[PDB]
């Protein structure tokens, strides 16, 4: 994994785990009014 050479060594297991976790299908439910209210607006 080339990416592992690029980051601090102590980050590597964390990122490895997170790469695996993100493989799991977990669809985001429709985003709340509250969350979307933080979107950019003119």
């Amino acid at each position: 994994e080339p990416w592992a050479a690029a980051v601090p060594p102590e980050w590597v297991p964390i990122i490895q785990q997170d790469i695996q976790s993100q493989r799991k299908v977990k669809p985001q439910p429709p985003l709340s009014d509250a969350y979307l209210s933080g979107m950019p607006a003119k």
Binding site: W3, A6, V7, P8, W11, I14, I15, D18, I19, S21, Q22, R23, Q28, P29, L31, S32, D33, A34, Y35, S37, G38, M39, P40, A41, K42
Partner: protein
């Protein structure tokens, strides 16, 4: 002196009459270059009308406070900002006048730099938070230097109004937007405060939530000036970053601002919503 006589007219309920007399003396003092006396009288008059529920007159006198500040080319000072935020807090939250006042007060506070002064933004945000107008509070916190207040507000907002699937997203959204304003200090503080104080986030870093590790690592990479690290992080956390369509656009902007990488996303939800340069 004259304040005594005007105050008596308001207390008698002659609001229209007192209002026009305040205006008369304002323009008279202004014509005589007595800008300070003009502002002081209008401010005390505004407060007096607010105490009687006379919002339209109070708001009008509040605009004349700003007229004096503008004409006299007064600079920001703590007392002036606190005065302007006090008047803001007394205005009807559902009046176009409050919108008008805020816009004009922030413009004055910029010393037309043209960014509204961050202490005024902070004061506004605090009021708006107390009023549970979280959407507007957040906007002003983002233009403030107050990451810690922002975080505490967002904990309340996320738990009160957000969904349980969004707990990590609210802090990601705030950090990324602070960084788009090149404010890495507040970005770090909002992250640290939010993750520690939020009831649904356990001890960390590292965190169980990948999006939170991404944001933690991103702050370290930006503060260290490490472009190669930044690039790896954005690549390996794409599944998390796709949860908000705008995250990759914020990261394009952040890459540009901190490292000079030309923006990569061909897509522009920004354009749809408002262009990122001019809609944060």
């Amino acid at each position: 002196r004259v304040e005594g006589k005007l105050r008596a007219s308001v207390e008698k309920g002659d609001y229209y009459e007192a209002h026009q007399m305040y205006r008369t003396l304002f323009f008279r003092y202004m014509s005589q270059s007595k800008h300070t006396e003009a502002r002081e009288l209008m401010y005390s008059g505004a407060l007096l009308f607010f105490s009687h529920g006379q919002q339209n007159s109070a708001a009008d006198l509040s605009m004349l406070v700003l007229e004096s500040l503008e004409k006299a080319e007064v600079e920001v000072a703590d007392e002036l900002l606190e005065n302007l935020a006090k008047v803001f807090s007394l205005m009807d939250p559902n009046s176009p006048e409050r919108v008008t006042f805020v816009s004009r007060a922030l413009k004055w506070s910029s010393g037309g730099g043209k960014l509204g002064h961050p202490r005024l933004h902070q004061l506004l945000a605090l009021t708006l938070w107390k009023e549970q107008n979280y959407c507007e509070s957040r906007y002003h916190f983002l233009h403030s230097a107050d990451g810690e207040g922002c975080a505490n507000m967002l904990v309340e907002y996320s738990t009160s109004r957000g969904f349980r699937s969004e707990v990590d997203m609210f802090v990601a959204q705030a950090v990324l937007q602070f960084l788009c304003l090149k404010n890495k200090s507040s970005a770090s503080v909002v992250f640290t405060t939010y993750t520690q104080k939020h009831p649904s986030i356990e001890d960390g870093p590292p965190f169980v939530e990948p999006l939170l590790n991404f944001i933690w690592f991103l702050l370290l990479a930006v503060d260290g000036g490490k472009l190669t690290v930044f690039t790896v992080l954005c690549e390996q956390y794409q599944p998390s970053l796709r949860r908000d369509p705008m995250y990759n656009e914020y990261l394009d902007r952040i890459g540009q601002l901190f490292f000079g990488v030309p923006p990569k996303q061909t897509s522009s939800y920004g354009g749809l919503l408002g262009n990122l340069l001019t809609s944060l």
